[PDB]
């Protein structure tokens, strides 16, 4: 299927080279795949989700019961799986709320959320963590444990224009750690960089769902916006390869990526940009 009038980040990932086509083509939809959005929640009623999003976990305890009162989680969910703004347009989406209305949360609550996904995820599964903070061996361990249980993790690199290896969970090697690019294929000014990245994806001026209403949208930037394009592609891959381990998924995403197109990628960064096209028997 080919989507016309596609937003730029989707437009970019289905092709190797610029210029943008205005189109996003996909052969799969992530039907049958489960995507756990570890974030500020999801406004599950949003039109973008068509009933495919549900709230499953909330460590904040403010009475939202997984609903998003920030926007970030909804926006991220929309990039993974929204009808118009998403990569994997039939994926199931699950709100694992570990951040509050200001996008803040205890480390303990984040670990609880990861561990909930380890124990309760429906396979095949992808988890998205567009969040981070200071180095935390406990959180690294929770993420490693969940990956060892068979769940692919997409991890934001962070937004300090620093080496990502200083941050958790970006420094978890087994997770797919994602830096941000702009529409000109430059590394975004704020993107973290370095050898803990796996690849880059579109992260600046990304349009997706928001929380002001069930038809709202917002256009924002971050490694938080890059990450869900990777999670989405992982869902596309997992629909065709439902028993694939996280190592196999990571190798398939990194091995398919477009090489050499990211400008100013930063010291020791892999010069690789997400690419969504996988071939199939006919
Ligand atoms: Ca395109
Ligand atoms: Ca990693």
Numbering used by the authors: 1 to 282
Q: What text appears in the publication on this structure?
A:
Keratinases are classified in the superfamily of subtilisin-like proteases, belonging to the serine protease (S8 family). In this study, we identified a thermostable keratinase (MtaKer) from the thermophile strain, Meiothermus taiwanensis WR-220, which grows at 55–65 °C11. Like many subtilisin-like serine proteases, bioinformatic analysis indicates that Mtai_v1c14470 consists of three parts, including signal peptide, N-terminal pro-peptide (N-pro), and mature protease, and has the three highly conserved catalytic triad residues Asp39, His72, and Ser224. Unlike most reported keratinases, which are only active at pH 6–9 and temperatures 25–50 °C4, 8, rMtaKer has keratinolytic activities at temperatures ranging from 25 to 75 °C and pH from 4 to 11, with the optimal temperature and pH at 65 °C and pH 10.
The crystal structure of mature rMtaKer was determined at a resolution of 1.50 Å and contained three monomers in an asymmetric unit. Two calcium ions and two disulfide bridges were also found in the structure of rMtaKer. The first calcium ion (1Ca), involved in stabilizing the surface loop between α1 and β2, is coordinated by Oδ1 of Asp11 and Asp14, carbonyl-oxygen of Asp11 and Thr23, Oγ of Ser21, Oε of Gln15, and one water molecule in a pentagonal bipyramidal manner. The second calcium (2Ca) makes contact with the main-chain carbonyl oxygen atoms of the Val172, Gly175, Thr177, and two water molecules. The second disulfide bond, Cys165-Cys196, is close to the 2Ca-binding site and the region carrying residues of the S1 active-site pocket, which was termed S1–S4 according to a previous report. The remaining residues at the C-terminal end (Tyr278-Glu279-Asn280-Leu281-Tyr282) of rMtaKer was buried in the active-site cavity of the adjacent subunit. Our crystal structure clearly shows that Ser224 acts as a nucleophile to attack the carbonyl carbon of the scissile peptide bond on Tyr282 and forms a tetrahedral acyl enzyme intermediate which can be stabilized by the oxyanion hole of Asn159 and Thr223.
